[PDB]
Amino acid sequence: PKTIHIQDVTLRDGNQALKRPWTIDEKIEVFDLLVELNVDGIEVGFPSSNETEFHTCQVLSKRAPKGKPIAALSRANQNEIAVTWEAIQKADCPRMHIVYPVSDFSIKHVLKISEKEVLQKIRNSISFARSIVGPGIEIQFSGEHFGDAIENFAFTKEAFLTAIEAGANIINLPNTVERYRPMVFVNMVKEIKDVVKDKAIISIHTHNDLGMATATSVESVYVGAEQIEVALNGLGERAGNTNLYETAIALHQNGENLNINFQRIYPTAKRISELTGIPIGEKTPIIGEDIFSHRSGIHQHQSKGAYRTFSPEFVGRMDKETISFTNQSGHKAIEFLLHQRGIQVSKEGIHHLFSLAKSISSRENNREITEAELVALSQ
Amino acid sequence: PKTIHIQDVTLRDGNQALKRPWTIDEKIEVFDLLVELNVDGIEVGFPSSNETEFHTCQVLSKRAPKGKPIAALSRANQNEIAVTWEAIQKADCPRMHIVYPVSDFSIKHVLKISEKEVLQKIRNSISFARSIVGPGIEIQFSGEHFGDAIENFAFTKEAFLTAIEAGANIINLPNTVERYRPMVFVNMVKEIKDVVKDKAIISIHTHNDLGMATATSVESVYVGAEQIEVALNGLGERAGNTNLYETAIALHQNGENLNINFQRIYPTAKRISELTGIPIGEKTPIIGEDIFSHRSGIHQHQSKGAYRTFSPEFVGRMDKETISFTNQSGHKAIEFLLHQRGIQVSKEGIHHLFSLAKSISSRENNREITEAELVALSQ
Numbered sequence: 145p146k147t148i149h150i151q152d153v154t155l156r157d158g159n160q161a162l163k164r165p166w167t168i169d170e171k172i173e174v175f176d177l178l179v180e181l182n183v184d185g186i187e188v189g190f191p192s193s194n195e196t197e198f199h200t201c202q203v204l205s206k207r208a209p210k211g212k213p214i215a216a217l218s219r220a221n222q223n224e225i226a227v228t229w230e231a232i233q234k235a236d237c238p239r240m241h242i243v244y245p246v247s248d249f250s251i252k253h254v255l256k257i258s259e260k261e262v263l264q265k266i267r268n269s270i271s272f273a274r275s276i277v278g279p280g281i282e283i284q285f286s287g288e289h290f291g292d293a294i295e296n297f298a299f300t301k302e303a304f305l306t307a308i309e310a311g312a313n314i315i316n317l318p319n320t321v322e323r324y325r326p327m328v329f330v331n332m333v334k335e336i337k338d339v340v341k342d343k344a345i346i347s348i349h350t351h352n353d354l355g356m357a358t359a360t361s362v363e364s365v366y367v368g369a370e371q372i373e374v375a376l377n378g379l380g381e382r383a384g385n386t387n388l389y390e391t392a393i394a395l396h397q398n399g400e401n402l403n404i405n406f407q408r409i410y411p412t413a414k415r416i417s418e419l420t421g422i423p424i425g426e427k428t429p430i431i432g433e434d435i436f437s438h439r440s441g442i443h444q445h446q447s448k449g450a451y452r453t454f455s456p457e458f459v460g461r462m463d464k465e466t467i468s469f470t471n472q473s474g475h476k477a478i479e480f481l482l483h484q485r486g487i488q489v490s491k492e493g494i495h496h497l498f499s500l501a502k503s504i505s506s507r508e509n510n511r512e513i514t515e516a517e518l519v520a521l522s523q
Numbered sequence: 524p525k526t527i528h529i530q531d532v533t534l535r536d537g538n539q540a541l542k543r544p545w546t547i548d549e550k551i552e553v554f555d556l557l558v559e560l561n562v563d564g565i566e567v568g569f570p571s572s573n574e575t576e577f578h579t580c581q582v583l584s585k586r587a588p589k590g591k592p593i594a595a596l597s598r599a600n601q602n603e604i605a606v607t608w609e610a611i612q613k614a615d616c617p618r619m620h621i622v623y624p625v626s627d628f629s630i631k632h633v634l635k636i637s638e639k640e641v642l643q644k645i646r647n648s649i650s651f652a653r654s655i656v657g658p659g660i661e662i663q664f665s666g667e668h669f670g671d672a673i674e675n676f677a678f679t680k681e682a683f684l685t686a687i688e689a690g691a692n693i694i695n696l697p698n699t700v701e702r703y704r705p706m707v708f709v710n711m712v713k714e715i716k717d718v719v720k721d722k723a724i725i726s727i728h729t730h731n732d733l734g735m736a737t738a739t740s741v742e743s744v745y746v747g748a749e750q751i752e753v754a755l756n757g758l759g760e761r762a763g764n765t766n767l768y769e770t771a772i773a774l775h776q777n778g779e780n781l782n783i784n785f786q787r788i789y790p791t792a793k794r795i796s797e798l799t800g801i802p803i804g805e806k807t808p809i810i811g812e813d814i815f816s817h818r819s820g821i822h823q824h825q826s827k828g829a830y831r832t833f834s835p836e837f838v839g840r841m842d843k844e845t846i847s848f849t850n851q852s853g854h855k856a857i858e859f860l861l862h863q864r865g866i867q868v869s870k871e872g873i874h875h876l877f878s879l880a881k882s883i884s885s886r887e888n889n890r891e892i893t894e895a896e897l898v899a900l901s902q
């Protein structure tokens with residue numbers, strides 16, 4: 145039986161990509177939505193960025209429920225690591241999260257340093273972090289641009305093993321920019337797991353540039369990833385982080401056990417939509433207005449039975465697909481109702497009652513016609 | 524080198540799920556957008572549905588460019604097949620598309636017939652189709668609900684081999700409802716390819732209920748699928764069909780050769796958006812308003828270089844990320860401009876010029892401040 149932790153990064157990766165970043169009270173509202181959704185951990189921010197974010201991280205750390213991992217992000221240097229720890233140490237379960245780049249391009253063309261120097265930086269930063277937080281505290285290390293570490297993939301194994309030996313309990317593998325295809329990333333995850341084994345938790349953090357973040361994250365589980373970093377409503381850099389709802393529902397549909405309160409999905413998404421001013425597209429998976437419609441029939445319980453993965457109510461929505469007597473499906477519905485009661489009426493009579501249904505609907509507006517009165521109208 | 528055909532089903536699967544189905548002139552406009560996008564084939568409709576759709580299919584068949592496959596969908600019965608052929612026979616390259624269910628549930632609980640009877644129906648319908656279209660004409664067979672053919676997967680191999688032997692040139696594998704995970708579907712595709720080999724083209728047709736249609740379609744290519752059925756703007760049943768743009772761009776980024784005019788992507792999507800009244804979400808991959816923004820820096824060419832898959836212009840968009848002197852990034856931009864010219868100004872002076880930039884922008888509205896005048900303002 146697989147353990148899969150859903151790690152939310154909305155307050156960090158999501159907030160920082162926002163056209164209109166959140167105030168402290170909005171961040172607190174979002175934090176509370178995350179707690180009620182029962183995610184397995186929450187990254188509250190990047191406290192080194194500025195004094196406001198520092199304050200927010202501290203407030204959220206103290207608000208955090210007991211036993212709920214509270215993470216904050218730091219770059220790989222002693223002073224910033226110390227500041228980060230100061231931000232979160234008051235949380236019941238603080239988690240230190242350190243990032244450093246590991247891709248060939250980053251090392252050769254951005255950092256312009258050797259691989260040996262990279263390993264030294266990784267080891268020194270994680271070791272230092274462990275020196276200030278003590279033994280009981282989870283440390284996560286992210287290899288930035290891991291998804292692009294193609295030419296230096298072997299190095300990447302060394303980097304993560306180094307991080308673990310220095311004290312990292314979680315190795316986070318980001319697909320910082322989505323460039324290829326899920327199984328390219330997933331094969332890399334598999335090879336990392338092959339050398340990490342039980343020495344650390346493998347986490348993944350995928351972005352959605354080619355519309356394949358959910359798939360990449362989901363398939364990573366089946367090669368050994370036990371944590372997925374996600375965001376509400378697919379917020380985050382560019383096209384966004386891995387969508388929390390799609391990932392949670394997909395894993396559930398595949399038989400996995402998650403702590404997520406699935407029925408909080410829709411009320412959460414609606415509120416996040418309001419807080420960001422980003423409407424929920426009507427065809428958006430899980431939460432889209434129109435995704436439970438089965439309309440194709442109009443052109444010619446069975447639809448609900450053979451063509452639905454999960455019910456509206458499962459994600460906290462009301463089922464709005466109610467048989468009506470006032471539309472393109474209106475006419476045939478009256479036929480079926482009359483059939484049920486054993487009332488025989490000609491095709492012209494049905495066409496008649498059809499018009500009466502749309503009539504007494506406009507009067508006392510709109511469209512709320514009962515079977516009982518429709519039976520009374522015919523006979 | 525892989526051959527991958529992009530087969531558009533917007534005028535069929537897309538149109539029939541539409542809240543407001545298209546008129547003949549709108550269908551013609553959509554058809555023309557598809558031709559200009561240079562998709563490899565177009566399914567024009569379901570001509571058996573009604574006389575209007577029949578007429579539309581005939582009009583589009585005659586409008587179709589030479590050498591462009593024009594498909595229309597039919598259920599697996601002689602009279603409907605004959606009607607369908609009548610609808611499309613005038614196209615330069617007509618393609619007959621027949622569907623019949625193949626999943627355990629469909630056969631046992633919906634059709635309530637034996638597997639032997641299913642094979643007979645498949646063979647008879649394809650053989651009949653071949654009898655009326657002649658040898659030169661492509662026949663596609665779809666096994667409806669293939670993605671759910673888990674308990675009877677072995678049967679599914681028999682069904683497709685039967686279809687091929689009867690005359691099917693293309694075997695289409697739909698993930699009618701997205702229920703699991705890409706690699707479950709993809710493994711099934713692989714096993715079908717293992718027995719079909721070079722006897723027919725494998726096509727896939729995935730839906731997007733769990734947000735993983737693009738991935739499922741893309742990964743299917745790497746186990747032998749040579750045709751992908753897609754729709755503009757992810758139109759189609761429920762959450763929609765596989766999104767054309769994401770699929771085309773992903774395959775291109777993975778080094779594949781497609782005929783798609785990539786630079787038609789954005790103008791097409793914008794027009795389809797208008798025709799359906801479904802806005803393009805600002806975080807939608809490829810075409811979303813906000814997906815080329817790199818904003819996270821504000822919180823503390825490189826961003827464009829290390830964090831972009833493809834350029835805005837590649838998909839027919841204008842790059843709107845222009846360095847401005849009027850915002851939260853405004854102040855530092857003036858610093859850098861003054862640095863370039865070797866003009867030294869105090870931190871208070873920069874703060875001053877910052878205010879002058881926002882001032883002469885409101886006057887003669889709005890926000891269009893040149894470097895040249897900003898240099899003239901400082902010195």
Ligand SMILES: CC(C)C(=O)C(=O)O
Pocket residue numbers: 157217243286288289316318319320321349351
């Ligand atoms: C800090 C890391 C995980 C990051 O956000 C990226 O690589 O996408």
Ligand SMILES: CC(C)C(=O)C(=O)O
Pocket residue numbers: 536596622665667668695697698699700728730
């Ligand atoms: C006709 C077939 C391909 C169909 O639309 C479905 O199975 O999704």
Ligand SMILES: [Zn+2]
Pocket residue numbers: 157318320349351381
């Ligand atoms: Zn990220």
Ligand SMILES: [Zn+2]
Pocket residue numbers: 536697699728730760
């Ligand atoms: Zn379909």
